[PDB]
């Protein structure tokens, strides 16, 4: 009994590669010479300079006086990832009592780029929106307005979505879609509140987005470490016995078995002591699990295959792995939502400091759509943080909800929040108009180890679900402001 009139949709960026960093210190003169005489931190991101550094590793490897083992991994890492935007080196010198550089800290950082699957996710979404729009009212395509944050991965999703939907049509708005240092500090302080939750014997007293079936967070964290120590030994055994270069026929993003080993070697180090697991590193583990389960399932299966008794993770042999996945999901679903505030006031305070501008703009867009007889649509592409915080504003506004905050699925890549505007169709004029809120968790799956994947390593987007029913326009604007 309602005719569509407009949509304000906020969309999260598409799939991206995990951020990764290798750290070690060297004292050999060849390593010190790379500083070019500088006695402070030096950052190298020019591809020309990265090639120069790369050659140094080949020369340093010729001489085993230094640590050749670290040179071997670093050289491959540098050459594979120096071709990627965002790959960088940080050189932190260490000065002795005579202001002489005796050793330099070599930090190689890379990752965080949108995967080759990102274009497909955004492209599919843009086409669907064009399809849906061309069926409701073709004039809406004539009234599309797109914004994006400054981050490359966000604009990347915005660009491909806009191309698929159809002079930069995307208008970068830092004030609305970009992060603020004040709020990120608050999220960090909330992060400091998360450390005790996993330690000692807390029993998630409030909802804390925690499954009732699961034991204490300190018991769950303890079991995960046991599984990690289990699989790392399986990995080592499989490295020692099997041909690792033949465990997967396809490698994307310039990855190879060595870089794969490095990701997990770091994670295994961070997940070898339950009483030391850092809550911020729980989110790190889960992100790597999604990536490999999407882009490196073949290698993942064989490198963690516990062997035969004597093409899928569905075996009692692979039971230790599925439980590890389930336990990681639980911990990720109990930490990440709470990084944006644990208490309603914190969830609210973080909610406003981050998404106060975006919330105002959405109301204005709906105001425009109502006053303008022509339906329209406005899309905002933002990072993951704004989605949670804006969602917090929605819940903390007291608006009647159709779905509980805890019951909401993970806000994965291409997660969407919609403010669909309609008209109240009756037999009397002057329709009262109505607003309906819907959400989509994006390209997310509940069974990463059972989903059938293509060579493109891509997951379809979950359809939107209604957070509310058709609610009075003026009423929805008053609750928010
Ligand atoms: Zn891939």
Author numbering: 536 to 701, 708 to 851, 918 to 1088
What does the paper say about this structure?
Inositol pyrophosphates (PP-InsPs) are eukaryotic nutrient messengers. The N-terminal kinase domain of diphosphoinositol pentakisphosphate kinase (PPIP5K) generates the messenger 1,5-InsP8, the C-terminal phosphatase domain catalyzes PP-InsP breakdown. The balance between kinase and phosphatase activities regulates 1,5-InsP8 levels. ScVip1PD is a phytase-like inositol 1-pyrophosphate histidine phosphatase with two conserved catalytic motifs.
In this structure, a large disordered loop (residues 851–918) was located and subsequently replaced by a short Gly-Ser-Ser-Gly linker. The two apo structures of ScVip1PD revealed a conserved histidine acid phosphatase core with two insertion domains. All four molecules in the asymmetric unit of our ScVip1PD crystals display the GAF domain in an “open” conformation. The N-terminus of ScVip1PD (residue 536) and the most C-terminal α9 helix (residues 1079–1094) are well defined by electron density. Plant and human PPIP5Ks contain sequence-diverse linkers of similar length between their kinase and phosphatase domains.
